[PDB]
C-alpha cells in the first residue's frame, strides 16, 4: 500500500512529476491539497484533465476553503489545522505516507515538513525539473505535452529528504477524533476545520514531552514519577521552602494519607459535638455536656499542657457518648465527611470497640457497626474521590488495670482480620499502652501468627528502651510519637535500615510537649522531622486527634513549615509517599492509593 | 540583544525586507547564509551595496562552498549540517535568535524551520512583498530603489510563525564542539563542514528521546528506570522468557549482586584447590588431599544427594587448609578474582574466623587478615570495575557441640562492626540452625543485621521464629514458604528477603527440570515473585556447586517455566535492596546496576 500527499500552489505540474517517484510502479493512491486562491483553479482543471488519463490509481483533490491568500499568521494557523486534519484523514498510517513539499508557499512547504516530522511519513521529497520545456525553452513544464515529455525523458530530479518516524504520542492519533467537513463540488472536495482542537492537543503533547525529557535525568530523586512532566520552573518551585500561608491551597488540594487518627477524639467539642449529640438514639441517656475549657491560644498554647490534660480535653466524646448507637453512627459518618473534605485518599482509624460495648451490645457488635458505617460511607462516594478507610484496634494498657480488655481487643482483631476481605478491613492493632509498664509480651504472638500488623504508640516517656522493645520484642512496624530517636544514634540507624515508619503529629506534639516555632536555624530543641528525613527514616505526618488538636491534616502539613526551619514541599511529598508505603494495605488498596497520589495539584504561584 | 539569521537564494531583497520586522526598532546584528551558485552573486554585490549605504547593525555573509545547486539528497544533508553548525556558531543563545525562511530553496526554508524547531529560536517569521513594481508595475521589488519604495509604501507583510523552545538536550549544544571553518574572500565568508558529527549526534539524541517517550508510559513496572531509553523492540525482548542457551552472554555481561557466598566452599576441588594449596606458608603441614568423587552428572545429578553429602563434598578445603595464613590469603584473592570475572558489583561473603584460629592466631587476627586481604584486592581495582565486598560471620550451631564458638563469633562480629567503617566491613551475622533468642539480643543492641539459614528441615515453625524471634532480615533457602499462606503474606509484607541458590537447591533437595508448566514440585521462584516476595538468586558454595552466579541465573530458566529476563533484573534489584550496605555503598551499587548490557539479538 502506498499513497501520495501533495500541496500545490500556482504550479500544478508538480503532481504529474510527483507520481514518478517510484517510476513505472507509481502510487496506489494520490491525494492533493491546495488553497482557495482563484489562480489555482485552472491548475485544478489541468490536474483533472491529466487525471482522466492513467486511470490506474485512485485520485482525489481537496482545497482549503478559508485560505484565500497568506495575509497574516491567523491564515497560517488555519492552514496548519486544515493540513493536519487532512493528513490524518487521507493518510491513516504513516508507514505508507508520501509527502511532497514542492508546491505552495515556502511557509506551506515548512508546514508540510513539520507535519511529516510530527505525524510521521514514509518518505518526504521535493521535485525539481530543469527549465527546458517552455517559451524558448526557458521555463519548466506548464502544459500536458511537455509534462509527458519530461516524464519520458527522465528530466525530473527527486531529493528524498528521508523518512520521518513521528512522535510516539502523535503517531497513534486517529482520523475521526478530528474530522473534516468535506463538500463535494464536482470531482474535487473542499475542506474546512470546524474547531482548533488538534493544534492545542499537539502543543500540549509536545510541551509534555519537552518537560519529561528535561526532568528525565532525575527520575529516581522524584518521590512520584509523574512529576517529571512538570515544567522545570514548577520543579524548582517544588524544591523551594514551603510557605505556611501561600501554599495553603496547594496542600489543601493534595491527596493525603492518614495513618494515626483516633476515632473517639474527633467530635470532642463544638458544633460537631452538638451534631453528634443530636443524633442520639436514646437522648435521655446522654450525659450532660461537661465544661472543658480549652487552654488560651488553642490550638497553639503558650506553654505545653502535657498528655494528661490533653486526654481530659476530650471527655465530652468517646466512651461516655459513643455507647449510643446513633451517636456512633453519626461519629463515623462525620469522620468520613471530614476525611473527604481534606482530600484524604487512604485512612487508618484507631477504634476501641470494647470501650463502647454495653449489656446488649458486645464488642463484636460495635466493631461490626463501625466497619459497616464506614463501608457504607465509602460505597456512596464516587471512586475518583473515595477515601479508603481501614481499621486498627487499640489495645490500651491500664496502670494496674484489667487485662481482659487487652485480651478481648486482640481476639477481636484476630477474628475481624479474616472476617472481612474487601472494603473496610481491620488491618492491625495499636498497642498504645506501652509506657511506664514495659521498658508480658507473650500476648502478641497470636497477632503475629495471623498476619496482623503492629504499631506501638508512645506515652510521653523519653526513654529509648521502649522503642527498642517495640522494634525487637513487639515486632512493631510503625512508631507513634517517636520524637527521641536521635538521642540514640544506633537506634535511629536501626529504625532507618529496617524500614520502620515514624508517625509524627505536629499539632499534638506541639501542644503536649512543646517545640520552638519560627526559629531561623535548627537547634537542640527543634522538631526532629528534618533530622529524621536526613537520616533515612520513613516519616509520616498525622493528626492523632482531629477534635482535641483542633487541626486538620492540611494544618499539620502547614505547621511543619513553622516547626522545621526551611523544610521544602518536596519533603511534604516525600512524607506522603512514605505514608503510602507504610500503610497496612494490600495490593488493590496500594494500587488505588498510588493511582490517587500521582495526581499532584499544579502550583499556581510559580512566578517568584 | 537580537540576531537576525536568514538565507538568500536567486533573490537578494529578502533580507532588506527582513530586518524591518520590528520596523524602526531594527536589529542589533544580521547574519546571512548563502550557497555557492554563481547565479546569485549579483545578489551578493547588491547586498554589499545595500549595507554600504545602510550602516548600523553588524553585517556578515557566509556561503557553503561545497553546495551549489539541489541535485540529490546528499547536497541537502550537506547544507543541513553546514546550516546547523552555522546556527550554533552565529547564534549561541536561543532567546536572541531570529530566523527568516523567505529566501533560498523551499527545502532550505524547510531546513530553517526544522533547525529552529530543534535548537529553539526567539521568533521564526516570513516576509512577503506585494507585487506592484517594475516597468509594468506587476512584479515584486527587485532593485534598491524598489526596496526603498516598498519600505516607504508599507507593502511588506510579515508572517510571524511563532517562537520555538527547542529540545532540552539540543538547546545546550555549543559551537566549539562542532566548529565551522571559514575562508575569507573580502567581506564574504566561505564555510564548509568537516564531517557529519553534529547531524549524527542530533539523530541519536532524537532517537533516544523518542525511546524515552515511548517507554515513559509504563515506567513504574521497569526495575531500572534507565531502561526507558531502550528501544521498544529491546523492551519487548526483555519481556520474553529467558533462554538458557542464547542469553548466556547477556547474563554474563550483567552487573550482579551476591548475598549468599561461603568463603570456605570456593576452592574445594580441581586445579583451583591445588592453586590454593601451592600458596601454603608451611607446605610440610598441609593435610593430604582426600579422595572425594563427585556424584555422576555433576553439577546436575540424576538424584539429589542431601545436605550431608553436599557438605562432605567440600572437605578438601576450609578448616583443613585455611588455618595456613598463606592458604587463607590465596583463598581470599582467588575468590575476589572469581567475583570480578563474573561482573559481581556487590558481594557479601560469610566466613567462620574462629574455625580458622590456632594457638598463635586468634579469631580476631584471622578476621582482620581476611578483611585486609579483601580490602587490598578491592584497592587495586578501578572503581568502575571494583567489586565491593562485605563480611558476614557464620554462627553455626550443631546437635550438642559447644556454645562457646557461637559466643565467640557473636562477640567478634560486634567488635568488628565498630572497628571498620570504610571499605570491607562486617555487616551482619549468619545463624546456620537457629529460637534461642537469648544470646542474639546483643547484636540487635548494636545494629547488626541477621540472616537466618534454613536447614534440611521441611518445617514452618523455624521460619516463623526466624522472622519474629530472631528478627532475621533475610531467609536462606526458604523453599517451603508457600505451604503456609500466612507466612508467605507476612514475609511479603514485612520486606524480608528470601535468598535462593538454584544449583545448590537442585543438588541437595532436587526439583524437576525443563517443565512445560508449573507443577507441584516446581521451583518456588515464580510463585514467590507473584506473591510480592523479594527473592534473590545466589551461589551458596562456588566450589562445591561448580557453578557461577551466571550459571544459577541461567539455570532458573530450566527450573522456572516461562521466566522472563525482566524477572532476572527484578531479582538483581531485590538483591540490591536486600543488602546490608550503607548509603555510600548503596549509591555505588545503584550506579553500577544502571548499566544493563544492550541485547544483541532482540528477535
Ligand atoms: N495522643 C495520644 N497519646 C497517647 N495516648 C493517646 C493519645 N490519644 C489517645 N490515646 C489513648 O488511646 C485511647 C483511645 O482513644 P480514643 O479517643 O480512640 O478513645 P475514647 O473513646 O476517647 O476513650 P476513653 O475512654 O479513653 O475516653 C485513649 O483512652 C488514650 O489512652
Ligand atoms: N549449604 C550450607 N548449609 C549449611 N551450612 C553450611 C553450608 N555451607 C557451609 N555451611 C557451614 O557454614 C559455615 C560457613 O563457614 P565457611 O563457609 O567459611 O566454611 P568452613 O568453616 O571452611 O567449613 P567446614 O569446616 O564445615 O568444612 C561453616 O561452618 C560451614 O560448614
Ligand atoms: Mg482519643
Ligand atoms: Mg476521647
Ligand atoms: Mg562451607
Ligand atoms: Mg569445604
Ligand atoms: Zn549456604
Residues A289 and A267: their CA atoms lie apart, in Å, by 13
Q: Name the β-bridge partners of B430.
A: B394, B451
Q: Are A326 and A363 in contact (CB under 8 A)?
A: no
Please give the class, per CATH, of domain B241-290+302-593.
alpha beta
Strands B388-394, B344-351: pairing is parallel
Residue A275: its H or E element: helix A271-278
Quote the cell numbers at residue B261. Answer: 557466598
Within 10 Å of residue A526's Cβ, how many Cβ atoms? Answer: 16
| Cell numbers that stand for A529 in this block | 522531622
Distance CA A134, CA A141 (A): 6
Residue B42 in contact with residue B17, Cβ under 8 Å? no
Identify whether the C-beta of residue A160 lies closer than 8 Å to the C-beta of residue A200.
Answer: no
Residues of B in contact with A450 (CB under 8 A): 486
Residue nearest to atom 31 of ligand 2 (CA): B311
Could you tell me the three cell numbers for B538?
545466589
Query: How many CB atoms are located within 10 Å of the residue A590 CB?
Result: 15
How many angstroms away from the CA of B573 is the closest CA of chain A?
A: 14
Ligand 2 pocket: which residues have CB below 6 Å?
B 262-265, 318-319, 350-352, 355, 394, 396, 432, 453, 540-541
Q: DSSP characters for B437-460? A: GGGGHHHHHTT-EEEEE--S---S
> Alpha-carbon distance B101 to A180, whole Å?
30
Cα atoms in the 13 Å half-sphere on the side-chain side of A329 = 11
- Name, in order, each residue with C-beta under 8 angstroms of A117's C-beta and a sequence gap of 6 or more: A164, A166, B114, B117
State how far the alpha carbon of B254 is from the alpha carbons of A368, B251, B549, in Å.
Answer: 53, 5, 10
CA B442 / ligand 5 centre spacing (Å): 26
- Residue given cell 544470646 in the structure block: B439
Q: How many CB atoms lie within 10 A of CB B253?
A: 14
Is the CB of B587 inside 8 Å of chain A's CB atoms? no
Q: With contacts defined as CB-CB under 8 Å, which chain A residues touch B464?
A: 449
Is the distance from the beta carbon of residue A319 to the nearest atom of ligand 1 less than 6 Å? yes
Report the chain B residue with the minimal C-alpha distance to residue A72. B159
Beta strands in B252-333 (DSSP E): 256-262
3-state SS class at B404: helix
A591 three-class SS: helix
- Measured in angstroms, the CA of B254 and the nearest CA of chain A are apart by 21
Subunit contact A107:B126, Cβ cutoff 8 A: yes
* CB contacts < 8 A (A, B): 131
Q: Return all residues near B369 (Cβ < 8 A) that are at least 6 apart.
A: B325, B328, B329
DSSP collapsed to 3 states, A15-76:
HHHHHHHCCCCCCCEEEEECCCCCCCHHHHHHHHHHHHCCCCCEEEECCECCCCCCCCHHHH
Cis peptide before A199 (omega within 30 of 0): no
Instruction: Determine the 3-state secondary structure of B164 from DSSP.
Output: strand
| Residue of chain A whose alpha carbon sits nearest to that of B124 | A107
Tally Cβ neighbours within 10 Å of residue B10. 12
Q: Which residue is associated with the grid cell 509517599? A: A577
Distance CA A27, CA A190 (A): 23
Q: A584 near A447, Cβ under 8 Å? A: no
Q: Any known ligand binding at A268?
A: no
Of the CA atoms within 13 Å of residue A154, those in its CB half-sphere come to: 3
Residue of A336, A365, A362, A364 lying closest to A263 (CA atoms) = A336
What is the distance between the alpha carbons of residues B54 and B44, in angstroms, rounded to a whole number?
Answer: 15
Q: How far is CA B447 from CA A535, B405, B440, B580, in A?
A: 15, 21, 11, 11
C-alpha closest to that of A579 among A319, A224, A333:
A224
Is B382:B345 a contact under the CB 8 Å cutoff?
no
Q: What are the grid coordinates assigned to A142, written together? A: 506548464
Contact by Cβ (8 Å): A223, A205:
no
Sign of CA dihedral B227, B230, B231, B237: negative
Retrieve residue B405's grid coordinates.
564458638
Residue written as grid cell 461516655 = A320
Q: How far apart are CA B570 and CA B556, in angstroms?
A: 13
Whether the bond into B299 is cis, omega within 30 of 0: yes
C-beta neighbour count of A155 within 10 angstroms: 18
A168–B214 CB contact, under 8 Å: yes
- Residue B260 near residue B310, CB atoms below 8 Å: no
- How far is C-alpha A147 from the geometric centre of its chain's CA atoms? 60
Q: Which residue has the cell 487552654?
A: A295
- According to DSSP, the residues that pair with B3 across neighbouring strands are B29, B97
Percentages helix, strand, coil for chain A (3-state, rounded to 5) are 40, 15, 45
Calpha distance B334→B402 (Å, rounded): 32
Rounded-to-integer distance, Cα A54 and Cα A148, Å? 12
Q: How far apart are CA B457 and CA B471, in angstroms?
A: 20
With beta carbons less than 8 A apart as the criterion, state whether A591 and A388 touch: no
3-state secondary structure of B579: coil
Provide the grid cell at A119: 505525524
User: Is B468 in contact with A450 (Cβ distance < 8 A)?
Assistant: no
All cell numbers assigned to B485 = 499462606
Q: Give the Cα separation of A608 and B23 in Å (integer).
A: 33
Residues A250, A253, A255, A257: what is their CA dihedral angle, to the nearest 10 degrees?
A: 80
Beta pairing class for B97-100 and B3-7: parallel
Half-sphere exposure of B190 (CA within 13 A, CB side): 10
The grid coordinates of residue B517 equal: 508448566
Enumerate residues 334 to 373 of chain B having a beta carbon within 8 A of any beta carbon in chain A.
none
E strand or H helix at B87? helix B73-90
Q: B199 — alpha (psi -120 to 50), left (phi > 0) or beta?
A: alpha
The helix (run of H) or strand (run of E) holding residue A157 is: strand A156-160
Give dist(CA A309, CA A316) in Å, integer. Answer: 14
- The H or E element containing residue B591 is helix B583-593
Torsion sign across C-alpha atoms A307, A308, A313, A319: positive
Instruction: For chain A, say whether B584 makes contact (Cβ under 8 Å).
Output: no
Read off the C-alpha cell for B462.
523455624
Distance from C-alpha of B143 to C-alpha of B134, rounded to nearest angstrom:
9
The string of DSSP letters for B60-86 reads EEEEETT--S--SHHHHHHHHHHHHHH
Q: How far apart are CA B398 and CA B402, in angstroms?
A: 8
CA of A276 to the centre of ligand 4 (A): 14
Give the span between the Cα atoms of A593 and B564, in whole angstroms. 28
The answer to whether residue A478 neighbours chain B at the CB level (below 8 Å) is no
DSSP conformation class of A153: T
- Cβ atoms < 10 Å from Cβ of B441: 12
Is the domain covering A3-200 a CATH 3.40.50.10770 domain?
yes
The rounded distance, in Å, linking the Cα atoms of B386 and B344 is 9
**Burial class of residue B416, CB neighbours in 10 A (0-12, 13-18, 19+):** buried
Question: What's phi and psi for A139, nearest 5 deg?
Answer: -135, 160
Distance of alpha carbon B529 from alpha carbon B571, whole angstroms: 9
| Ligand 2 atom nearest to CA at B544 | 8
A234 is in an annotated binding site: no
Q: Backbone phi, then psi, for B189, in 5-degree steps?
A: -75, 155
Q: How far apart are CA B431 and CA A317, in angstroms?
A: 51
Break-preceding residues in chain B (C–N over 2.5 Å): 434
Closest CA to B171 of A70, A309, A232: A232
Q: What is the DSSP letter of B36?
A: -
Distance from C-alpha of A335 to C-alpha of A319, rounded to nearest angstrom: 16
Residues A524/A563, Cβ–Cβ less than 8 Å: no
A75 known member of a binding site = no
A543 alpha carbon, closest ligand: 1
Q: Which of B160, B167, B445 sits opposite A213 (nearest CB)?
A: B167
- Spell out the SS3 assignment of A298-324: CCCCCCCCHHHHHHHCCCCCCCCCCCC
Decide: helix, strand or coil at residue B99.
strand
* Burial class of residue B302, CB neighbours in 10 A (0-12, 13-18, 19+): exposed
Which chain A residue lies closest to B463 (C-alpha atoms)? A449
Per the DSSP assignment, residues forming a β-bridge with A456 are A431, A479
H/E stretch holding A184 reads strand A183-185
CATH code that applies to domain B3-201 = 3.40.50
Binning chain B into helix, strand and coil, the percentages to the nearest 5 are 45, 15, 40
Residue B99 with chain A: CB contacts under 8 Å: none
Q: Is A222 helix (H, G, I), strand (E, B) or coil?
A: coil
Cα–Cα separations (whole angstroms), residue A125 to A117, A122, A497, B113: 13, 10, 61, 16
User: Torsion angle of alpha carbons A341, A346, A350, A356, nearest 10°?
Assistant: 60
Residue that the C-alpha cell 459535638 belongs to: A273
DSSP alpha helix (H) spans, B165-241: 197-216, 232-238
Q: DSSP assignment of A492-516, as one string? A: HHHHHHTT-EEEE-HHHHHHHT---
A195 annotated among ligand-binding-site residues: no
Question: How many CB atoms are located within 10 Å of the residue B199 CB?
Answer: 17
In whole angstroms, what is the distance from residue A393 CA to residue A397 CA? 13
Measured torsion, CA atoms of residues A114, A117, A121, A123, in degrees rounded to the nearest 10: 80
Question: Which residues of chain A come before a gap where C and the next N are over 2.5 Å apart?
Answer: 439
Ligand 5 centre and the CA of B502: distance in Å? 16
Identify the CATH homologous superfamily for domain A238-597: Metal-dependent hydrolases (3.20.20.140)
Answer yes or no: are the C-beta atoms of B15 and B32 closer than 8 Å: yes
Q: What is the domain partition of chain A in residue ranges?
A: 3-200, 238-597
Contact B411, B362 (CB under 8 A): no
Task: Match 498504645 to its residue by C-alpha cell.
Answer: A432
DSSP string, B240-271: SB--TTTSHHHHHTS-EEEEEEEGGGSSSSSH
SS3 A325: helix
Query: Measured between alpha carbons, how far is B23 from B18 in angstroms, rounded to an integer?
Result: 10
Q: How many CA atoms lie within 13 A of B576 on its CB side?
A: 24
Among the atoms of ligand 2, which is closest to the Cα of residue B504? 1
- The 10 Å Cβ neighbour count of residue B245 is 7
Closest by CA to A394, choosing from A353, A441, A362, is: A353
**B486 to chain A: which residues are within 8 Å by CB?**
449-451
Is the Cα dihedral A51, A52, A56, A58 positive or negative? positive
- Residue ID of nearest Cα to ligand 1 atom 16: A264
Chain B window 140-169: which residues touch A at a Cβ cutoff of 8 Å? Answer: 157, 159-162, 165, 167-169
Distance (Å, rounded) from C-alpha B110 to C-alpha B87? 15
- H or E stretch at B128: strand B121-129
Alpha-carbon span B171 to B87, nearest angstrom: 12
Mutation test of ligand 1: which of A307, A357, A394 has the most ligand atoms closer than 8 Å to its C-beta?
A394
A72, A109, A536: residue with CB nearest B159:
A72
Half-sphere exposure of A159 (CA within 13 A, CB side): 22
Extract the C-alpha cell encoding B300.
546436575
In 3D space, the residue among A497, A460, A459, A503 whose CA is nearest the CA of residue A478 turns out to be: A503
**Residue B212: which of A126, A216, A587 has the nearest Cβ?**
A216
Q: How far apart are CA B552 and CA A546, in angstroms?
A: 54
State the maximum Cα–Cα separation within chain B, in Å, rounded to a whole number: 119
Using an 8 Å Cβ cutoff, are A357 and A363 in contact? yes
Nearest 10 degrees: Cα torsion A221, A225, A229, A235 = -30
Q: B430 labelled as ligand-binding?
A: yes
The angle at the Cα of A530, spanning A524 to A536, to the nearest 5 degrees, equals: 120
Beta strands in B470-577 (DSSP E): 474-476, 497-500, 534-537
Phi, psi of A64 (to 5 degrees): -85, 125
Mutation for testing the B interface, residue in A164, A166, A216 having most B CBs under 10 Å = A216
Q: In this structure, what are the phi and psi dihedrals at residue A129, rounded to the nearest 5 degrees?
A: -135, 135
**Where would I find the H helices in A186-322?**
197-214, 232-238, 248-252, 271-278, 306-312
B101, B107, B168: residue with CB nearest A213: B168
Q: Of the ligands numbered here, which is closest to the C-alpha atom of B545? A: 2
Best CA proximity match to A366, nearest among A414, A422, A327: A327
Amino acid at each position: 500500500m502506498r499513497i501520495l500527499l501533495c500541496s500545490v500552489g500556482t504550479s500544478w505540474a508538480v503532481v504529474p512529476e510527483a507520481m514518478q517517484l517510484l517510476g513505472s510502479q507509481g502510487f496506489d493512491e494520490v491525494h492533493v491539497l491546495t488553497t482557495a486562491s482563484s489562480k489555482i483553479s485552472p491548475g485544478v482543471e489541468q490536474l483533472l484533465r491529466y487525471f482522466e488519463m492513467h486511470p490506474g490509481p485512485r485520485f482525489s483533490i481537496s482545497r482549503v476553503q478559508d485560505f484565500e491568500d497568506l495575509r497574516s499568521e491567523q491564515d497560517h494557523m488555519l492552514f496548519e489545522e486544515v493540513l493536519w486534519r487532512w493528513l490524518l484523514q487521507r493518510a491513516p498510517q504513516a508507514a505508507h505516507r508520501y509527502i511532497c513539499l514542492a508546491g505552495g508557499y515556502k511557509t506551506i512547504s515548512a508546514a508540510m515538513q513539520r507535519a511529516a516530522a510530527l505525524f510521521g511519513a514514509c518518505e518526504v521529497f521535493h521535485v525539481l525539473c530543469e527549465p527546458r520545456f517552455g517559451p524558448q525553452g526557458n521555463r519548466e513544464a506548464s502544459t500536458l505535452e511537455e509534462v509527458e515529455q519530461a516524464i519520458a525523458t527522465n528530466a525530473l530530479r527527486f531529493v528524498r529528504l528521508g523518512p520521518e518516524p513521528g512522535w510516539p504520542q502523535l503517531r497513534l492519533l486517529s482520523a475521526p477524533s478530528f474530522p473534516l467537513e468535506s463538500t463535494l463540488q464536482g470531482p474535487v472536495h473542499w475542506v474546512r476545520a470546524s474547531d482548533m482542537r488538534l493544534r492545542q492537543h499537539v502543543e500540549g503533547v509536545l510541551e509534555r514531552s519537552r518537560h519529561i525529557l528535561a526532568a528525565w535525568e532525575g527520575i529516581s530523586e522524584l518521590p512520584i514519577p509523574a512529576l517529571a512532566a512538570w515544567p522545570p520552573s514548577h520543579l524548582r518551585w517544588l524544591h523551594e521552602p514551603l510557605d505556611p500561608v501561600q501554599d495553603k491551597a496547594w496542600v489543601q488540594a493534595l491527596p493525603k494519607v492518614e495513618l494515626h487518627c483516633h476515632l473517639g477524639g474527633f467530635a470532642t467539642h463544638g458544633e460537631l459535638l452538638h451534631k453528634v449529640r443530636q443524633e442520639a438514639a436514646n437522648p435521655e441517656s446522654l450525659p450532660p455536656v461537661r465544661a472543658i475549657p480549652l487552654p488560651p491560644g488553642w490550638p497553639i498554647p503558650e506553654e505545653p499542657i502535657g498528655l494528661e490534660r490533653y486526654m481530659r480535653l476530650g471527655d465530652n466524646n468517646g466512651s461516655a457518648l459513643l455507647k449510643d448507637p446513633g451517636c456512633l453512627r453519626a461519629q463515623c459518618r462525620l469522620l468520613y465527611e471530614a476525611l473527604l473534605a481534606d482530600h484524604v485518599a487512604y485512612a487508618e482509624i484507631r477504634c476501641s470497640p470494647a470501650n463502647y460495648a454495653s449489656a446488649s451490645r458486645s464488642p463484636w457488635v460495635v466493631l461490626q457497626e463501625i466497619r459497616n458505617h464506614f463501608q457504607q460511607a465509602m460505597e456512596e462516594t464516587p471512586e475518583d474521590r473515595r477515601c479508603h478507610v481501614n481499621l486498627l484496634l487499640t489495645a490500651t494498657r491500664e496502670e494496674g488495670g484489667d487485662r481482659s480488655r487487652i485480651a478481648r481487643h486482640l481476639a477481636l482483631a484476630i477474628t475481624a482480620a479474616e472476617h472481612w476481605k474487601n472494603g473496610c478491613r481491620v488491618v492491625g492493632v495499636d498497642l498504645a499502652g506501652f509506657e511506664d509498664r514495659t521498658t508480658f509480651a507473650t500476648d502478641f504472638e497470636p497477632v503475629h501468627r495471623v498476619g496482623l500488623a503492629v504499631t506501638v504508640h508512645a506515652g510521653e516517656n523519653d526513654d529509648v528502651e521502649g522503642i527498642w522493645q517495640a522494634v525487637f520484642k513487639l515486632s512493631a512496624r510503625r512508631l507513634g510519637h517517636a520524637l527521641h530517636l536521635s538521642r540514640s544514634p544506633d537506634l535511629l540507624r536501626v529504625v532507618a535500615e529496617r524500614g520502620i515508619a515514624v508517625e509524627l503529629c505536629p499539632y499534638a506534639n506541639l501542644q503536649i510537649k512543646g517545640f520552638p516555632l519560627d526559629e531561623e536555624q535548627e537547634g537542640s530543641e527543634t522538631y526532629p522531622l528534618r533530622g529524621y528525613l536526613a537520616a533515612g527514616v520513613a516519616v509520616t505526618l498525622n493528626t492523632d486527634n482531629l477534635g482535641i488538636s483542633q487541626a486538620s491534616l492540611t494544618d499539620n502539613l502547614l505547621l511543619t513549615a513553622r516547626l522545621c526551619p526551611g523544610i521544602t514541599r518536596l519533603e511534604v511529598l516525600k512524607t506522603q509517599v512514605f505514608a503510602a508505603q507504610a500503610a497496612f494495605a494490600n495490593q488493590a488498596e496500594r494500587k488505588a492509593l498510588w493511582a490517587r497520589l500521582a495526581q499532584v495539584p499544579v502550583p499556581t504561584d510559580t512566578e517568584q
